[PDB]
From a paper:
Superposition of the three refined structures of the 66.3 kDa protein reveals only slight variations in the overall conformation. The major difference between the three structures concerns a linker peptide of about ten amino acids N-terminal of C249. The most significant difference concerns the peptide bond connecting residues S248 and C249. Upon cleavage, the conformation of S248 and C249 changes significantly. The cleavage is additionally accompanied by slight changes of the torsion angles of the adjacent residue S248, which is within the allowed region of a left-handed α-helix before and in the core β-strand region of the Ramachandran plot after the cleavage. Based on these observations, we assume that the processing step which gives rise to the 28 kDa and 40 kDa fragments starts with a cleavage between S248 and C249. All functional Ntn hydrolases known so far are activated by autocatalytic cleavage.
Author numbering:
A (entry chain A), B (entry chain A): 61 to 239, 245 to 594
Amino acid sequence: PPVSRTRSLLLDAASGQLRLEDGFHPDAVAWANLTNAIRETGWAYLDLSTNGRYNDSLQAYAAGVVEASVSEELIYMHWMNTVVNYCGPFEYEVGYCEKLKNFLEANLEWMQREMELNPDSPYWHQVRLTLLQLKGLEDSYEGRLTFPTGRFTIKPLGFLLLQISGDLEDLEPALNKTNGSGSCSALIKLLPGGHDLLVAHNTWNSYQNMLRIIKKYRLQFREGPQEEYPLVAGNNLVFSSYPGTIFSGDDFYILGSGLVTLETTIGNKNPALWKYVQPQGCVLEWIRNVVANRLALDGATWADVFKRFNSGTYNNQWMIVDYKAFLPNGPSPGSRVLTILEQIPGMVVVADKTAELYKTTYWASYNIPYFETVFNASGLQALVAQYGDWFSYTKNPRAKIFQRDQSLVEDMDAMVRLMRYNDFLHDPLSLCEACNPKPNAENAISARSDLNPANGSYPFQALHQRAHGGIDVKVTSFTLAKYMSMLAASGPTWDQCPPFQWSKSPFHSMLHMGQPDLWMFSPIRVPWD
Amino acid sequence: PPVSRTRSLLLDAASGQLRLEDGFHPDAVAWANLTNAIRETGWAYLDLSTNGRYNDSLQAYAAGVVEASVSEELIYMHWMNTVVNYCGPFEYEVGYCEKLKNFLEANLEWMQREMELNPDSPYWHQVRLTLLQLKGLEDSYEGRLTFPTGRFTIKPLGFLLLQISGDLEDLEPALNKTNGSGSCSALIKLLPGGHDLLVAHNTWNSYQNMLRIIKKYRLQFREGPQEEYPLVAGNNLVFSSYPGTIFSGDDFYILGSGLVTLETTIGNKNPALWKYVQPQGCVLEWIRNVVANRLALDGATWADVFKRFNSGTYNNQWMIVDYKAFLPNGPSPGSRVLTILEQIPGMVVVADKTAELYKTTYWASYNIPYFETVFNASGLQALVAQYGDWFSYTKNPRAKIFQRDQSLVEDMDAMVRLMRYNDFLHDPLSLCEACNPKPNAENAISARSDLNPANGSYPFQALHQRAHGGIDVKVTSFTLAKYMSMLAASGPTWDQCPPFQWSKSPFHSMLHMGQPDLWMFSPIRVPWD
Ligand SMILES: *[C@@H]1O[C@H](CO)[C@@H](O[C@@H]2O[C@H](CO)[C@@H](O[C@@H]3O[C@H](CO)[C@@H](O)[C@H](O)[C@@H]3O)[C@H](O)[C@H]2NC(C)=O)[C@H](O)[C@H]1NC(C)=O
Ligand SMILES: *[C@@H]1O[C@H](CO)[C@@H](O[C@@H]2O[C@H](CO)[C@@H](O[C@@H]3O[C@H](CO)[C@@H](O)[C@H](O)[C@@H]3O)[C@H](O)[C@H]2NC(C)=O)[C@H](O)[C@H]1NC(C)=O
Ligand SMILES: *[C@@H]1O[C@H](CO)[C@@H](O)[C@H](O)[C@H]1NC(C)=O
Ligand SMILES: *[C@@H]1O[C@H](CO)[C@@H](O)[C@H](O)[C@H]1NC(C)=O
Ligand SMILES: *[C@@H]1O[C@H](CO)[C@@H](O)[C@H](O)[C@H]1NC(C)=O
Ligand SMILES: *[C@@H]1O[C@H](CO)[C@@H](O)[C@H](O)[C@H]1NC(C)=O
Ligand SMILES: *[C@@H]1O[C@H](CO)[C@@H](O)[C@H](O)[C@H]1NC(C)=O
Ligand SMILES: *[C@@H]1O[C@H](CO)[C@@H](O)[C@H](O)[C@H]1NC(C)=O
Ligand code: NA
Ligand code: NA
């Protein structure tokens, strides 16, 4: 991309068509601004806004159009790095790809019918806006605008598999594809004397996904299809994202409603549960994620909306922090501050864990579900019995590191240092006994899988050498959320581990267009470089 | 790939299935051996052989299978560099891609019907073998073998657009796609006192296509479907090729029948001729190319076979040199040594130019058709009148360079030096008067378009700065053809121009997996590094 690029989408009355322009224009349906600083900071920055004098449907479709236009090259590169050959005209597993094509077409169609049968329903109005935005993104990148007034078709293997990237980790085993992760860590820390409440997230992902865009949507959507509806509470939102992906993905959101939402992927290892993964009655996580962010005021409200049409795909522990319920220096309000939701196929458990947050002064998060029920139901007891405390909730490497180091986070920088922490060679809690060598780079808060020897003896895939591990840290406070801001550090950890460099890594061969060769980037404050 | 890899395909009687093995196995249907030396020489080397105790159909299908298995990674990389996003799920020109999908499906189906209606015909037996080999290549790469006994389907946008790469330059304008080249130069030189006859070719192509494989097929096909048929004359053939592409492409072949075939793309700039480009009655050039190579004994025989079902796609001047007709040190046989064929939509002209070769002692080739008729019919007179002698047959930059330098080629090395020649800064014949600056890197025998300034004033696209130009030189003599050998130099010219390096070029951004960064490779003799 350029250093900075600005686009606007106007409803041209000379033709009744939508067309793109360059620069800010006040009466445009939507306008976007992408600042690329991936070379200097490891982040691109996108500020997107829609005009509230047009209907939500047009606003939404436009929001996709303007985003795609400012971020063309990044979308191309990210596509080329991540999901370019996924179910291509060659896929070895021709059985699976047919089943996935059928599942998604049947699913998208089911959503279309629900919209057609429920024109007055807020919830299905919210899904349509989300799907219209994806339509916009795609049509804009394809360079042929066409605003649908009624029913419309979304291409199964287009920009959808940029959104369902997380959902796919559960769809493959559900559809009998033959072929670990850990996938993220999070910390919610209450500071001494209740001075402030810090919430942070660290994405674990493949290093190929390391094209990053911090996105700020300032929208003007309403709760329902009629215009007598009030504007949605979650109209303003800042979040860590990727090119094309119209939602977080790694999952860190700061909403203008005083809500901070984030997750860690708990997954599911019980196959008798894939039967609850269906085309009809299921909405893929990423949409539910968005719809919930948009409508929520409370943590309880958020939970309610996300639960609807649970898909059993992209199975997470969802932390919903409500800063409206947080009083600086005050005591426990007893409720409303922290809500934990956990999802597995056919099961969703919700609880208000405010008392817990205040009693223990923190909430940690990793690949292991909290709720005793979910843990058993997802079939983790067999893995504890087979592989020991690595699958235990309170005894896994990461759980222990938090247990003895979490009290040290006293401010923002202290939080970053912990969330970036990885010293597997010298920390006794990173030792794997079933391994050879014993120390493992997975057994840290910010994983660094590439630094494991390619010829080691490991009990399971998650501990093998991989172009995978922690790839970012995002942190926010009370005051910083009040001002829609965060601290963000891009790339794998280099606090103690040698900084990641593609050239010098055993993965030099893997393609990574637009990615910096060396990753030595420091945290920065948004908004804007 | 590895340094060397060997695969075999056996008809396993324990199941009646085809399965792949590692290493040479004598009773296999087919076996292939790929030696990668792209880092040292710029060439990979493939020796492929089929068993003559099986039927041609199985032999052919197997020949595709074994090739794909030994060259998996190269096929992947070449695909990723060349035609990965061609008519993807995003193509801007959604009108064109639909028309191309329809054209190719209708074309492939037309061929299938012809086979079904002509089970005793040699010609359609030869097409089926070619198509079965493409089927093999694809199915093998997909990892699911399935030998078709009767009718079979070839996927339009699979490994077909690796083969139709040349055909596509004429299909796009024919199907009204909105969106130069020069595309190759060749020299056939008769040495003083008729001591020897040298024939050489230099490909002009995009630098992204610079993954190269010199291929040697040693096949056991018969002329017709019945087994009373004699073995085809062109069973053994060495040629310069690319990963996946089951024919030359750039087009240089040395056949075991004493025939050397090569071309330069003359194209067509008269749109009133695209009407002759049809799904039915047309066979795409690449197949015709193969079929002709396989059946030919004479140059006249070759010409006959290539002419059949002319498609008007991939329009070339075809030089057919028959070393059987060549007598060392002797005088002119009057006929049979050199045959020139030229193709444009709906028109093919053939002639025996032996007398010409002997009278002038050479035959040069460039982007301009020889035959006066073809020149007029393809609409080049308007371009001469509009842009001067750059489109003239005898007065274009390359025609003049041959005219004054061709006598100097006295041996193999002298031939390479000419075919690699490019000194655009200091050669008066590389000066473009309508240009700014005047000297142009296109106006050489081995083009070097990248060395033109990106901010120059050029009259037409062919002279703009491009990641395009001469990318190889292949040379052969009488004695070297007798022993199925050639000299081959990989990469853009560096005799006088600074050697090409992706890193230091204004095209560093373009992806080129498996390609050496710097290109300073010298000529080598095949067979084998
Ligand atoms: C939100 O606002 C947009 C734009 O104001 C509305 O889109 C417009 O919808 C009407 C149909 O309800 C279209 O006008 C009609 O077009 C048809 C087909 O050409 C024609 O038969 C009719 O005579 C009429 O002219 C109009 O083209 C369309 N505008 C665009 C840019 O697509 C939309 O209906 C509003 N609400 C919704 C549900 O999105
Ligand atoms: C060339 O040789 C190959 C291999 O020897 C021949 O392929 C074989 O063709 C026959 C059918 O003509 C197949 O046997 C039949 O299979 C069907 C369907 O399963 C079954 O109904 C019959 O009872 C019979 O068993 C055989 O499977 C097949 N072999 C392979 C490996 O595919 C081929 O026919 C010969 N000629 C041609 C035209 O290619
Ligand atoms: C993009 O737009 C924002 C919105 O005001 C502005 O602050 C910023 O300067 C723009 N980007 C650049 C660097 O041009
Ligand atoms: C997956 O395979 C199981 C057998 O192991 C089968 O019962 C199930 O139907 C398959 N799932 C689907 C619906 O693809
Ligand atoms: C989970 O399963 C174990 C047996 O494997 C059992 O001991 C434990 O009570 C279960 N947890 C609950 C209460 O569901
Ligand atoms: C591949 O096979 C050929 C055929 O004989 C042989 O000469 C060559 O040594 C093999 N390649 C290598 C280097 O293993
Ligand atoms: C291409 O466009 C011309 C008009 O310029 C039209 O006559 C012709 O039918 C088109 N070719 C095809 C068949 O797509
Ligand atoms: C080619 O066309 C030109 C007129 O543009 C004419 O002078 C010339 O004779 C033609 N060549 C032949 C013989 O077809
Ligand atoms: Na995650
Ligand atoms: Na050519």
